[PDB]
Ligand SMILES: CC(C)CCC[C@@H](C)[C@H]1CC[C@H]2[C@@H]3CC=C4C[C@@H](OC(=O)CCC(=O)O)CC[C@]4(C)[C@H]3CC[C@]12C
Ligand SMILES: CC(C)CCC[C@@H](C)[C@H]1CC[C@H]2[C@@H]3CC=C4C[C@@H](OC(=O)CCC(=O)O)CC[C@]4(C)[C@H]3CC[C@]12C
Ligand SMILES: CC(C)CCC[C@@H](C)[C@H]1CC[C@H]2[C@@H]3CC=C4C[C@@H](OC(=O)CCC(=O)O)CC[C@]4(C)[C@H]3CC[C@]12C
Ligand SMILES: CC(C)CCC[C@@H](C)[C@H]1CC[C@H]2[C@@H]3CC=C4C[C@@H](OC(=O)CCC(=O)O)CC[C@]4(C)[C@H]3CC[C@]12C
Ligand SMILES: CC(C)CCC[C@@H](C)[C@H]1CC[C@H]2[C@@H]3CC=C4C[C@@H](OC(=O)CCC(=O)O)CC[C@]4(C)[C@H]3CC[C@]12C
């Protein structure tokens with residue numbers, strides 16, 4: 087759903103899987119890369135907007151996990167993904 | 168009855184067999200009586216508008232204008248001013264009508280049902296600012312100007328959608344040859360409308376850079392233009408990209424950034440020639456090589472000054488042809504006023520130079536004349552995106568400088584006379600009294616504090632006057648021959664109060680005044696600079712490619728044109744032109 | 760080789776800034792001072808235009824007799840630039856503060872400034888103006904330009920801080 091720029095599908099498939107923080111950062115990694123690999127800049131506006139929406143959820147979900155346990159959310163970043 | 172809920176259920180239900188003429192005269196009373204919500208219903212169920220807008224019914228529509236209007240009499244006066252000579256008694260004429268009679272919601276709807284969304288939104292803004300100036304009373308002009316902002320809203324909002332859709336295909340929206348108004352352009356429409364909000368948006372501003380760098384790929388760097396200006400061989404190279412090698416030459420030297428840089432290089436060389444005349448080639452001999460080259464240079468500067476004068480909307484219309492408007496609008500630009508003060512006291516400085524008696528006055532006028540030509544360096548670089556919005560700021564700061572200069576000058580009189588009165592010099596000439604009162608205290612603001620000239624405990628030789636009292640000799644040249652030492656505890660105290668008020672209270676409160684009004688005017692003067700920008704882009708695009716010293720080639724080409732006897736618009740085919748308006752009427756409907 | 764190494768010390772010392780940008784206390788403020796360059800360059804534009812305007816008009820009004828191009832480009836640029844920082848040489852520009860008023864066989868009245876690079880003798884024709892034209896300089900540069908640069912720094916520090 088990230089590849090075909092299906093916004094609400096990717097926003098839902100992130101919610102039903104494991105690896106919330108890494109795939110929110112992973113979704114942000116693809117959509118900034120794949121906008122540079124995109125020829126036309128019209129759909130790249132939707133490609134970059136949906137990258138900010140995963141930037142919202144990764145920041146929002148990690149800030150919950152960090153205020154829960156600063157030790158156990160430290161291990162969230164430095165996990166060998 | 169002005170009851171909408173009846174009119175829907177009558178037309179939506181109840182054996183729906185409405186014919187033509189049942190709807191035709193129904194929309195008349197929907198238009199003659201104001202009632203715009205009934206109008207949207209009938210157009211939603213569809214009318215002809217090619218069998219509805221028969222010219223009797225339009226004359227019928229204008230006949231129901233109110234008698235005590237600024238329109239009915241304006242028709243009877245005629246029975247913007249060219250609209251009067253054009254309007255007499257399918258949507259564009261109908262949109263024109265609702266603007267004329269200030270019918271707000273009717274015009275807001277007729278804009279939505281027609282073609283040409285961006286040009287008629289700018290066109291509606293053009294009329295309602297013009298027709299408010301043509302309106303006698305200012306009560307309804309508040310509604311006339313408010314409904315002009317509502318079309319300013321929709322033109323900015325709809326173009327920003329069209330620009331983010333396709334920056335190329337919305338670039339063609341502006342520079343389309345609009346066959347209304349005698350082949351008008353939507354940027355020209357936005358200039359004449361004084362559409363500051365329309366120029367301020369990032370689509371038009373990015374379009375202005377592409378017009379600025381005309382056929383030279385506006386993302387090109389600046390140093391490559393400098394490298395290609397001073398190497399015209401380097402024009403045809405791996406640097407600056409563009410979109411017959413002779414048109415390739417003319418796309419460079421006809422582009423407005425190179426006409427600008429030509430005008431900048433040739434003006435920095437004018438000021439370098441002016442200075443080398445003024446500093447090292449200005450003996451009382453008759454004028455030599457470079458001084459006569461300066462006089463011809465400033466003639467061309469004057470011949471280039473009349474080109475803007477006799478080649479010059481919130482005012483008159485284009486092509487006025489009577490010079491009591493064209494020269495009056497020339498001597499209203501604040502730059503021309505600087506350009507003519509420079510060229511008239513160059514003429515004074517040369518006329519006083521050539522006469523034998525007035526030579527030192529001719530030099531003195533030319534030194535101040537360099538000052539005025541150099542300040543014209545500021546007006547040139549206000550087209551720059553990096554410098555320009557900040558040059559326009561520093562004139563908004565003058566209202567605070569003048570407060571400072573008031574508050575300081577009052578305090579400088581107060582300090583300066585009290586100090587000159589307490590220590591009484593014996594060399595009290597009026598040039599020297601007005602110097603120790605004003606000039607010497609003014610310099611104490613800048614760290615020039617002459618303690619040895621005001622404080623007696625720092626000066627020796629305490630017997631220098633036969634007048635009664637005790638005296639002391641200040642070692643300064645214009646400090647008086649000897650000053651009094653009666654109350655020099657006070658003069659030293661009164662300096663302390665001066666440096667507190669001037670150097671600390673006044674200077675740091677001026678920074679608070681600059682920092683405040685920089686915060687206010689930053690938004691509005693950038694908004695003003697955006698709209699000013701296109702006025703300066705096409706002011707270089709219309710200017711000849713040859714600069715000031717070599718402009719006489721392009722004036723002996725223009726004058727030889729008359730013995731033998733910038734309107735920007737990109738050209739495209741009508742089928743590619745209707746594809747543009749079809750694309751754009753979709754994005755109006757997708758926006759509404 | 761010595762001269763290049765003295766400028767080379769300058770460049771190695773500025774690399775001291777790039778090192779301490781990892782600091783939490785200093786670092787966010789080192790990254791600010793490069794955002795300020797767009798306002799320095801306006802100031803440096805507006806001053807430099809006014810420094811040409813003041814500097815040539817002053818060097819034209821008082822005409823020195825030691826008008827070499829290094830010294831002309833010094834009394835035009837360097838000496839007015841230093842007046843922004845409180846180095847105002849009144850004795851070199853104002854004739855009423857200098858004695859020895861017969862120092863040139865050229866026609867007109869002259870006067871000797873005691874400065875080393877102030878010219879051998881300057882003119883005293885319109886030195887009411889040079890003194891006035893200094894007053895306008897210190898108003899534009901030292902007060903209008905400097906305090907408007909603070910307003911420009913205080914504004915763009917507010918924008919770029921976040
Ligand atoms: C009095 C002196 C300075 C005589 C002039 C010497 C010239 C041969 C040269 C030396 C370097 C040149 C400058 C190199 C950089 C450019 C940037 C250029 O800016 C632009 O045109 C593009 C910016 C924009 O988009 O508005 C203006 C000309 C300018 C100052 C050139 C102007 C003339 C200069 C000063
Ligand atoms: C009491 C003594 C100091 C005499 C008073 C002199 C000042 C009232 C005048 C003389 C020269 C003026 C300056 C000449 C150069 C200009 C550039 C000007 O900027 C522009 O013209 C930009 C063009 C534009 O924004 O339209 C802003 C004011 C300023 C600094 C002026 C500020 C006020 C000054 C100092
Ligand atoms: C900036 C605001 C707060 C007001 C400050 C005004 C002064 C800085 C100006 C207005 C009156 C001027 C002066 C009028 C009288 C003289 C004496 C004059 O000395 C001479 O005797 C030489 C020839 C002459 O003018 O008689 C030199 C210029 C000077 C200081 C003028 C230059 C600077 C002055 C003091
Ligand atoms: C040219 C001179 C200064 C020769 C150097 C003499 C050194 C033997 C010593 C004297 C005191 C020392 C300083 C004492 C305090 C520290 C703080 C330290 O900052 C950090 O590493 C932690 C801050 C952060 O978390 O980023 C950097 C080194 C420094 C400046 C030391 C650097 C080397 C210094 C100057
Ligand atoms: C017309 C005359 C004055 C010659 C013009 C010289 C200036 C245009 C240049 C030469 C040295 C420069 C300075 C050298 C040291 C730097 C540090 C620099 O900060 C950083 O590099 C931080 C690193 C980063 O933020 O990426 C900010 C600009 C600054 C002050 C420069 C400001 C502009 C300067 C004065």
Ligand SMILES: CC(C)CCC[C@@H](C)[C@H]1CC[C@H]2[C@@H]3CC=C4C[C@@H](OC(=O)CCC(=O)O)CC[C@]4(C)[C@H]3CC[C@]12C
Pocket residue numbers: 803806807810829830832833836837840
């Ligand atoms: C900061 C902005 C507003 C522009 C200011 C530029 C000046 C401060 C710079 C550019 C030209 C420079 C000068 C070019 C000519 C000279 C004369 C020179 O005196 C000499 O004769 C010694 C040897 C020589 O250079 O010939 C000493 C350096 C100096 C002042 C240079 C140092 C400072 C100057 C005046």
Ligand SMILES: [Ca+2]
Pocket residue numbers: 472475502503506
């Ligand atoms: Ca002009």
